[PDB]
Amino acid sequence: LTLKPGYVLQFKLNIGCTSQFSSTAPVLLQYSHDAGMSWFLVKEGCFPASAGKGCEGNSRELSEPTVYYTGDFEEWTRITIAIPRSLASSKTRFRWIQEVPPFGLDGVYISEPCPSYCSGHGDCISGVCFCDLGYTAAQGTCVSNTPNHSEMFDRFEGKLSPLWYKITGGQVGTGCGTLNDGRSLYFNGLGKREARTVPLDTRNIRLVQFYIQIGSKTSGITCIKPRARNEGLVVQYSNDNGILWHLLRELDFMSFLEPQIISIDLPREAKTPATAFRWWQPQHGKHSAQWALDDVLISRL
Ligand SMILES: [Ca+2]
Ligand SMILES: [Cl-]
Numbered sequence: 001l002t003l004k005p006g007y008v009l010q011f012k013l014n015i016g017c018t019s020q021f022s023s024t025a026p027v028l029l030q031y032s033h034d035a036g037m038s039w040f041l042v043k044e045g046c047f048p049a050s051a052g053k054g055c056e057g058n059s060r061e062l063s064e065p066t067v068y069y070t071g072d073f074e075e076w077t078r079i080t081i082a083i084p085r086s087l088a089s090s091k092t093r094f095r096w097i098q099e100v101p102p103f104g105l106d107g108v109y110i111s112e113p114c115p116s117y118c119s120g121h122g123d124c125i126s127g128v129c130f131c132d133l134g135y136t137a138a139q140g141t142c143v144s145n146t147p148n149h150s151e152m153f154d155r156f157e158g159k160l161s162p163l164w165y166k167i168t169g170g171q172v173g174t175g176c177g178t179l180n181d182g183r184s185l186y187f188n189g190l191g192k193r194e195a196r197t198v199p200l201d202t203r204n205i206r207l208v209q210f211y212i213q214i215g216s217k218t219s220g221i222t223c224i225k226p227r228a229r230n231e232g233l234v235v236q237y238s239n240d241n242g243i244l245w246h247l248l249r250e251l252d253f254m255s256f257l258e259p260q261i262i263s264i265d266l267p268r269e270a271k272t273p274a275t276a277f278r279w280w281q282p283q284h285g286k287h288s289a290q291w292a293l294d295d296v297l298i299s300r301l
C-alpha cells in the first residue's frame with residue numbers, strides 16, 4: 001500500500017493473556033519497502049544515546065521500538081503509530097512476526113491523518129474518527145463524555161491509583177529499598193518498563209513531583225548498577241493519549257543511585273483538558289538496572 005508522511009498505522013494486540021514474560025519470541029512489527037526480501041522495524045527506537053538519522057539533536061522524539069514482548073500484553077492493547085517522513089517512501093508492506101503463544105491481531109487500519117488523531121480515543125478509518133466507548137465525536141476528533149480527573153497522588157502502599165492507565169514491567173514492591181517511605185512502584189520487568197497515567201485535566205496543574213531511584217551501588221541483584229546511558233529514564237507528556245509524547249525531563253542513568261526528589265514546573269503546552277504523563281526506561285528490561293518511583297504527585301500546588 002502507498003503511504004503519505006503524516007499517515008497513521010493502527011492495530012490491536014493480545015499475545016496470550018499472560019502476565020508472565022518470555023524472551024523466546026516477541027512480536028516484531030517490521031516494514032518492507034522492496035515488498036518482501038528486506039525487513040526493518042517500523043521504529044528502531046529513538047533513545048538518549050542514539051545519534052543516527054531521524055533521532056538527532058534537539059528535534060528528536062524519544063520513542064520505543066515496535067517490538068512487543070510476551071507478558072507485556074495481558075489484555076487487548078491498541079497501538080497507534082504516526083508514519084514518519086523517514087519511511088514515507090514507496091508502497092510499504094508490514095509484517096507482524098513472532099519467530100510460544102500465537103499473537104492475536106485485530107483492527108488493522110492504515111489511514112490519512114484524522115482530525116487531531118482522534119485525540120488517541122478512537123480508530124482512524126480513512127481520515128475520520130470512530131470513537132471508543134465513553135467518548136463522542138466532536139470537532140472532528142474524539143472527546144470524553146465526562147471531564148477528566150485533575151490531581152493525582154500515589155504513595156504505593158497498596159492498591160495502585162485508578163489514575164494509572166497502564167503499568168508495564170512494574171508493581172508495588174521494595175527491590176530498590178526505601179525511597180521516601182514504605183513500598184514503592186518498582187520496575188524489574190524484562191520487556192518494557194513504563195508507568196503511564198490516564199489523561200488528566202492539567203489546565204490548573206502546576207507541579208509534577210515524584211521520588212526516583214535508578215539502580216544502586218549496594219542493594220544487590222534486585223537493584224543493580226546501571227551500565228549504559230539508555231538505562232536512564234524519560235518523563236514525558238502527551239496531549240493525545242499516547243500517540244505523541246513530548247519531553248518533560250530526562251533523568252541521567254548515573255545520577256539516581258540513591259533516592260532523590262524531582263519537582264517539575266509544567267510548561268504551558270502540557271496544560272490541557274486531557275494530558276497524560278509517563279515514566280519510561282528506553283533500554284529493554286532484560287539488560288537494564290531496575291528502578292522505582294515513590295509519592296507521585298500531580299498537583300495544583
Ligand atoms: Ca511509598
Ligand atoms: Cl534532573
Ligand SMILES: [Mg+2]
Binds near residue numbers: 250252
Ligand atoms: Mg543525558
